[PDB]
Design a protein around this ligand. Sequence first.
Ligand code: ADP
Ligand code: ADN
Ligand code: CL
Ligand code: K
Ligand code: MG
Ligand code: MG
Length: 341
Amino acid sequence: LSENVLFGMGNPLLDISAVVDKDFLDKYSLKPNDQILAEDKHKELFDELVKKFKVEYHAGGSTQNSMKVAQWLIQEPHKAATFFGCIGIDKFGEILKRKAADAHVDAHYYEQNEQPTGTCAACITGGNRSLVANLAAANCYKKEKHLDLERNWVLVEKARVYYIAGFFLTVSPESVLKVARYAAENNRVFTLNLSAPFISQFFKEALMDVMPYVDILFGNETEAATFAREQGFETKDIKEIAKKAQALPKVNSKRQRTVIFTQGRDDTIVAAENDVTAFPVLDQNQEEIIDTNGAGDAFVGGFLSQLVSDKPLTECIRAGHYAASVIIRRTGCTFPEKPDF
Ligand SMILES: Nc1ncnc2c1ncn2[C@@H]1O[C@H](COP(=O)(O)OP(=O)(O)O)[C@@H](O)[C@H]1O
Ligand SMILES: Nc1ncnc2c1ncn2[C@@H]1O[C@H](CO)[C@@H](O)[C@H]1O
Ligand SMILES: [Cl-]
Ligand SMILES: [K+]
Ligand SMILES: [Mg+2]
Ligand SMILES: [Mg+2]
């Protein structure tokens, strides 16, 4: 593989992670398994987390996590995976830079000095993770001042595979579209996550603007169900949702869309190759689970590590299941130094 063969961009966040209780979730009107954007009522949540819960700080952000997981499984060369996004000039920013370097990703941040680096409260209860994202600097990403510069754009031009989490549609749909159109015009593979229910609910115009450029769509079962509802697809069958998403208007007709929905411990659903297939999750030992935060990002990273080396679908899924199995045994979207795949 070459350097910069995989490209992502997104919201670089520092995760502030801790095991909480139902009470804590309930006083902040938080679902046990959800992802939301921070509101004013959530400023006290972050303070309370750090004062009374056993917080760990780990690099996060959905696309950043998948770029790191991908790199991890690739191993060599270093800098196979590129990541762009915006941070502040602060301690949390410095942490994110260090962890990107440690992960051997080619990270190029837009740094600005007004907003702090973005953070995400990762509130863990049993097999559940409730995420509250305070994007801050991540929301200040400027296409015209970063992606569009030739010294950055050349890295985009080096990639065979692109991945952007749907989360980034809340920040820069224009960036997403520029990369997607580039991918389509060059018959490269562009990939995207549904990310969270709120993306289908509140950012559906931007989502449906990018959808025609999507060669592989990722998501979980709850995200799929929401996307279906918000498109008027009524079905009691996740396989049908994946088929319907597969058949959406597509600009690059030379590649068929592939749609892949994970379902936690239930089977991963893949619409591809004129069929829909369920791939079981063979790792079912619930007693070893530490924290499911990052499971789906690790699944994507695992999948992408194999995709860039032209591996078969089965092996792509296998690597995504393996990476998720490692990540759910640790705090945050973290991993040991080496894979065992
Ligand atoms: N409780 C679990 N038991 C075993 N594997 C799990 C569990 N939760 C997640 N995983 C693994 O992580 C993958 C993605 O998890 P999922 O919960 O669907 O995604 P997300 O993190 O996007 O909500 C699953 O396909 C599976 O490989
Ligand atoms: N709005 C968001 N944008 C980008 N990443 C997010 C957002 N909300 C949560 N995440 C990330 O999702 C990861 C878990 O999938 C966490 O590491 C967290 O940082
Ligand atoms: Cl992201
Ligand atoms: K985890
Ligand atoms: Mg889960
Ligand atoms: Mg997810």
